[PDB]
Write an enzyme that holds these catalytic residues in place. Structure first.
Site, mmCIF file in Angstrom:
data_model
loop_
_atom_site.group_PDB
_atom_site.id
_atom_site.type_symbol
_atom_site.label_atom_id
_atom_site.label_comp_id
_atom_site.label_asym_id
_atom_site.label_seq_id
_atom_site.Cartn_x
_atom_site.Cartn_y
_atom_site.Cartn_z
ATOM 1 N N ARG A 1 2.411 4.897 2.841
ATOM 2 C CA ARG A 1 3.750 4.974 3.472
ATOM 3 C C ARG A 1 4.018 6.303 4.172
ATOM 4 O O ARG A 1 3.801 7.373 3.606
ATOM 5 C CB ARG A 1 4.857 4.664 2.468
ATOM 6 C CG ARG A 1 4.859 3.202 2.075
ATOM 7 C CD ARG A 1 5.772 2.936 0.903
ATOM 8 N NE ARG A 1 5.827 1.495 0.616
ATOM 9 C CZ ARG A 1 6.712 0.941 -0.210
ATOM 10 N NH1 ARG A 1 7.605 1.710 -0.818
ATOM 11 N NH2 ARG A 1 6.733 -0.365 -0.402
ATOM 12 N N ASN A 2 4.498 6.239 5.409
ATOM 13 C CA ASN A 2 4.726 7.449 6.192
ATOM 14 C C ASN A 2 5.852 7.220 7.196
ATOM 15 O O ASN A 2 6.297 6.081 7.396
ATOM 16 C CB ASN A 2 3.429 7.911 6.896
ATOM 17 C CG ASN A 2 3.422 9.405 7.223
ATOM 18 O OD1 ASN A 2 4.344 10.153 6.872
ATOM 19 N ND2 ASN A 2 2.370 9.845 7.913
ATOM 20 N N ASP B 1 0.837 -1.199 0.000
ATOM 21 C CA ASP B 1 0.000 0.000 0.000
ATOM 22 C C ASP B 1 0.863 1.236 0.000
ATOM 23 O O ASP B 1 0.958 1.949 1.005
ATOM 24 C CB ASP B 1 -0.957 -0.002 1.195
ATOM 25 C CG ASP B 1 -2.081 1.006 1.045
ATOM 26 O OD1 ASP B 1 -2.929 1.084 1.959
ATOM 27 O OD2 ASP B 1 -2.128 1.726 0.022
ATOM 28 N N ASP C 1 2.013 3.454 8.525
ATOM 29 C CA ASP C 1 1.109 3.456 7.354
ATOM 30 C C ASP C 1 -0.124 4.328 7.591
ATOM 31 O O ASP C 1 -1.191 4.054 7.044
ATOM 32 C CB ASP C 1 0.698 2.035 6.945
ATOM 33 C CG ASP C 1 0.054 1.227 8.095
ATOM 34 O OD1 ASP C 1 -0.195 1.768 9.194
ATOM 35 O OD2 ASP C 1 -0.189 0.017 7.898
HETATM 36 C C1 LIG Z 1 3.607 -2.388 9.300
HETATM 37 C C2 LIG Z 1 3.671 -2.702 7.812
HETATM 38 C C3 LIG Z 1 4.456 -1.593 7.139
HETATM 39 C C4 LIG Z 1 3.859 -0.352 6.944
HETATM 40 C C5 LIG Z 1 4.535 0.697 6.321
HETATM 41 C C6 LIG Z 1 5.849 0.497 5.867
HETATM 42 C C7 LIG Z 1 6.656 1.580 5.207
HETATM 43 C C8 LIG Z 1 6.587 2.907 5.668
HETATM 44 C C9 LIG Z 1 7.362 3.924 5.115
HETATM 45 C C10 LIG Z 1 8.233 3.653 4.058
HETATM 46 C C11 LIG Z 1 8.310 2.317 3.562
HETATM 47 C C12 LIG Z 1 7.535 1.299 4.145
HETATM 48 C C13 LIG Z 1 9.213 1.984 2.434
HETATM 49 N N1 LIG Z 1 9.574 0.828 1.953
HETATM 50 N N2 LIG Z 1 10.425 1.074 0.876
HETATM 51 C C14 LIG Z 1 10.599 2.392 0.727
HETATM 52 C C15 LIG Z 1 9.862 2.981 1.667
HETATM 53 S S1 LIG Z 1 9.575 4.675 2.008
HETATM 54 O O1 LIG Z 1 8.426 5.106 1.260
HETATM 55 O O2 LIG Z 1 10.805 5.422 1.928
HETATM 56 N N3 LIG Z 1 8.994 4.720 3.567
HETATM 57 C C16 LIG Z 1 9.268 5.899 4.398
HETATM 58 C C17 LIG Z 1 6.446 -0.770 6.087
HETATM 59 C C18 LIG Z 1 5.766 -1.814 6.715
#
Ligand SMILES: CCc1ccc(-c2ccc3c(c2)-c2n[nH]cc2S(=O)(=O)N3C)cc1
Length: 262
Positions: A141-142, A137, A155
């Protein structure tokens, strides 16, 4: 899909004011009363459409996914309430969203702090990469701020993000750890820009043409040349030429130390 050992009795939660939003609805501040802590501040994800069972299934899937992870720089799942109204209970990052944190603190954060944040996130991302987890999703992303010296992946806040996406994701909807690396390169740029968004004033449709012309986001003011160089490596057009998260985490460590030697 058992949540039994993290199912929370409702009377242990005091639902406070709305503090943000997720894909499924409003996020509230709350207090959780348990033996461990008489009054723990929490964030509570709510769901506007969880009277529909298909929606309810997708929402609680966020919790089932979050449950499988445990990392210092990933927002922790505290528990769930799977009876209506369904809630997901998360740790509260008291200092809010990193973007606005950075905007209000442009002159009160040392360069070492900015680099630390990038490093911490890379440790979380390398952890997920080792687990073979591709977070789907991408619009959700946050990054949230739990303290002055701790940021976490999340998220929710406190359309597709074309301006943040790798060329193969834009062109062909291919999503791999290498596309995640491209997006993290952008996240690092935003940190060093104190929260400015990429491609401001550019139409989404024009992004791919600029990338394919060789254009890249410019070095942020006062950004260490070595750190900008690292960002440009995340933006190799060929996904196979980008660094792995394990390499990013190693490089960010050397950069962090060097800034602390200055
Ligand atoms: C709990 C499941 C989950 C939820 C969100 C992320 C998440 C949040 C932020 C991200 C990311 C993942 C992320 N993955 N790869 C690159 C990025 S990013 O867009 O730089 N970034 C800040 C990972 C696992």
């Amino acid at each position: 899909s058992s949540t039994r050992d993290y199912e929370i009795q409702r009377e242990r939660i005091e639902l406070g004011r709305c503090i943000g939003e997720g894909q499924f609805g409003d996020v509230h501040q709350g207090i959780y009363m348990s033996p461990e802590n008489p009054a723990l501040a929490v964030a509570i994800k709510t769901c506007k459409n969880c009277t529909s069972d298909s929606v309810r299934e997708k929402f609680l899937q966020e919790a089932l996914t979050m449950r499988q992870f445990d990392h210092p720089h990933i927002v922790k799942l505290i528990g769930v309430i799977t009876e209506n109204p369904v809630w997901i209970i998360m740790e509260l990052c008291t200092l809010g969203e990193l973007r606005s944190f950075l905007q209000v603190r442009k002159y009160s954060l040392d360069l070492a702090s900015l680099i630390l944040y990038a490093y911490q996130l890379s440790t979380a991302l390398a952890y997920l990469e080792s687990k073979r987890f591709v977070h789907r999703d991408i619009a959700a992303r946050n990054v949230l701020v739990s303290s002055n010296d701790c940021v976490k992946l999340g998220d929710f806040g406190l359309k597709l993000p074309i301006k943040w996406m790798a060329p193969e994701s834009i062109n062909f909807r291919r999503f791999t750890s290498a596309s995640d690396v491209w997006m993290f390169g952008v996240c690092m740029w935003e940190i060093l820009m104190h929260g400015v968004k990429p491609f401001q004033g550019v139409k989404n449709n024009d992004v791919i043409g600029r990338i394919e012309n060789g254009e890249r986001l410019p070095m942020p003011p006062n950004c260490p040349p070595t750190l900008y160089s690292l960002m440009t490596k995340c933006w190799a057009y060929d996904p196979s030429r980008r660094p792995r998260f394990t390499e990013l985490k190693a490089q960010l460590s050397t950069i962090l130390e060097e800034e602390k030697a200055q």
